[PDB]
């Protein structure tokens, strides 16, 4: 939130280039968390395609015969949809040990 | 951008101030004149894109002197120096200064009489038109994270 | 079918859009070692790593590079940046973006000019990792 | 592929919308006109094969303005800017956008009068026709192995 | 008699047909050692091995090379491919095909563009063994 | 070898099948025609020896269209595409296929009217004539060896 | 927007204005060392210093360089100078000046002429530190 | 008097006439060592041997080189050949033939083609001894 | 203001005026060593000496160089000469003369000619000390 | 079977020293030098040897990122007490057949480098040692 709400709310125009810049910033933040071994590696940040599709369908947009790139380029007024994928390691809670005589 | 009409008007005004002979733009008037008339025209324009939004322009501007009465060639040689004294480094058109890369002049005979041809080239970078959509500032940012 | 033309190229450096950019280029060069295996005439290779190399070329509109790195270079601390390149030809079907990270510049050009020539600046750089956005 | 007739029609339609003077394609009509007529034609086409199935095309398109009444050269200089304002980056022909590599313009005298000549080049890749035989999917594959 | 023109050239890479290909080239370079034999002025050579080298040149229609090798190069595992080249000029009597196996690419070009120039990509490679089909 | 008459006949036959207007080879007939006639000729041939017995030939073939009646320039632009549709890659002359290296087309005015000029070049290797003496097989070989 | 042309270039050497100057150039080249870190394919670099290089090109109007350095070079003491370069194109918005300090010249040209050719002199130099005046 | 033109050139390789041949070249390069003798300013040389070098250039009409050497190169045995070159210009007075023996080829070209370009193959080689037939 | 043209150039060699001279050139190249001082990123240099180099280019009117140095070179004793260069363009304000002493020539050209080409001779040389007369 | 890709690369190794992973490691090497005595047996020309023991030797080279080596032994050496450490080396190449791990025990270091630097040169520290025992863990 100190990256998102502090600067990118109400101070930056909502254009696809700025969306890409915000995505890059978030990914660069996640790299530091990965390097401290808090989460696992290979964490991806990208545009939430399904939520954006639903919001576009909510208004008067014919989603047919539109390119996926054309869908992503659409300007969703003043709202941004993003989706992240991160992995967290759980503690040991089950053990299955086998012994051969 | 910058309009060619403005450049032609600026050059014509300079010539009007610095010379007493008449200045014409179309061939019919110089044909109908009694003698010692100028002629101003833009010879050619070349546009090349050097960046996404800007072009590079080279404009060649031609000035002609046609003395009709006899024994006025010495007047042409006098006028050459006065023309040289004006277009040395740059000219100012619409609060913008454009460089003059080189000067060229030649004395050749056209039809039955000799004429003086004074040319020079302007080089400057100019921007093409574009239409930009306006977006409102970011207000709400949704970030959902999962596996 | 059309091939993307480089006229439609945009570059973001350190979060700021670079208005003047003539060309951009980034490449990854691999490191290989020759290995000869007994009983085989052909020679095989083993891959050991890679290096990132590239350069920019931009007109001398302003003093960007100095304001970027000049004082920090003298002080003894070397800064690192991130650059984004976008190529979107309207004739082609889709666009392409790349994020290049951990950039370090090879040199700095204080001044360079000649009579009758518009100024140009080219700055090579080396990078370590890249990330891909809007794959075609 | 893409037809030249469509490109000419698109340019003629653009000129019709943006200018009030008449547009002609043939010499006799511009000769018979009373004055201030346009002329549009495709100067040259160059085709070069760059791949097995595609060619590379460079098309040079010429626009001419011939003002018949006297003292209309200033109108020509005005019209040059309006022509420049339209053909900056690309044009759309049959849901396809073609780049404009460079612009060229020259003012020269033809026969007894001066004319304006506005040209530009389009560059795009296009595919040649071919006929491909249809085969049915593989159903039975026989493989006999021996010494 | 006619000599085959390179306009009629097709390339298959990793089992997929490469629609855009400007040129293809593959060569085998031998390794020799100088040996001087007593009593002879002329110097003889002994053949001790060979190396396979080549390159491709294709227009920048899509991001093929990245989807091929980009993530695996970072991970630390190098992939190998098989490429097939076919040259069939209708004027000439017959066709020619070659299978090149165990291909490894020398570098990767993330992005390269310039104003007013259509993009081109060339990627050298090294191979070990080849097989011949439809020999003229 | 391969005869130029055969190439010209093949092109004329193709044009006859694909177009309804008449095709002529000599200037007098096209002058005497009432309108909308073709013209086919071989522009130039260049021969260069690349091997002992073979030459390299570059043949440039010219096709002309001269519409006499008024308002047939749009027909010229229509005909350009139909001509383009035929000569894409190669043509077959006497069970031999010859490549087409490049295409060129230009619209220029000749005498008082505009004409369309469609050209392309063929490239192929061809063999010169030679006379070879016939020898009989070896029957007796004498070899005497001494100091 | 316009890019500055080098026609509007002036140079001050040792406190004296150089009337004839065809071109001026000064650059800072960095020194880097390759460092390989265990567990990473990409190779990183460490910045260890920099070098200053440049040159001048001026017409042979007078014997300036000799009067500058000739006798001191023979005697055994090498002088150091300060040079100022100014670039102010009227079309562009602002001007730019740089002060280059601790200059040492690489060579001295006694005489050089050819039939039908106007004389030109170019003298490379190396510098250590720079200061910036009137940044853009 | 006339100088022979290379148009009238024929080549026999391994007992088979090579129909397509653009040029042929064979040279003998000597090996010399510098020797300095006391009391003499001029430096003399001693001849210690020689090397044979050359190349061929021929159009890509057929797959000759592969059928010649391909399988044997992989197997591990290098073949040697004999080539005969004849130059007989009708304008000149006489003809010239040379037999080149113990030929070994430097490399093998599997495939090489480009759009709009007729294929050409050039193969360098090294030889040891030569014999002369029909000297002029 | 005018720049001196090289058409007005005269050369005196060994006290004799050289009538035919196409160009003359003499330069002093300094020797520097890199020195790295603790606590400073910029690298400094120390001047440790210099070398004098130059060359002449003159038409092959007569056999001057042989009569100068030929027999003495064979005998084993190398001669040294003094050359004077004068550059006096009437348009320019003043003249310039330089005396170059302790000249030694690098090579000797016995003969060199080709069909349809006028002969030219160029002889590089190395010098130690110079003296200046009529400084502008 | 045998292929070029199977050869292990040194970039993929890592080293644990005293239970703490060392990230700034350049190379690691361990070896065991056997002791053999020549014995001449009557009636046979070829000499034969008898094995009596082994000696362990090795070294570690690492970038001079931090003063790690001082904190381990600097104060203890002056007082007269010698510490013993345990090192674990793991070599995990994705192309090769798995990974091999070895534990080297009873390590005693040969020298301590207080300071070593030169103008214009990056810093490196190499420390040789001797050991006595070893274990095999996940050998290929």
From TrEMBL, chain A:
Span of domain Tail sheath protein C-terminal: 1-101
Family: Belongs to the myoviridae tail sheath protein family.
Record protein name field: Phage tail sheath protein
Taxonomic source organism: Clostridioides difficile (Peptoclostridium difficile)
Upper lineage: Bacteria, Bacillati, Bacillota, Clostridia, Peptostreptococcales
From TrEMBL, chains B, D, F:
Species annotation: Clostridioides difficile
Protein's UniProt name: RtbA
Gene this protein is translated from: rtbA
Origin superkingdom: Bacteria
Record-linked InterPro entries: Phage_tail_terminator
Entry-linked Pfam families: Phage_tail_terminator_8 (PF20765)
TrEMBL record, chain J:
Gene3D superfamilies per UniProt: Phage tail tube protein (2.30.110.40)
InterPro entries xref list: DUF2001, XkdM-like_sf
Domain of life: Bacteria
Protein name (record): Phage tail tube protein
Classification lineage: Bacteria, Bacillati, Bacillota, Clostridia, Peptostreptococcales
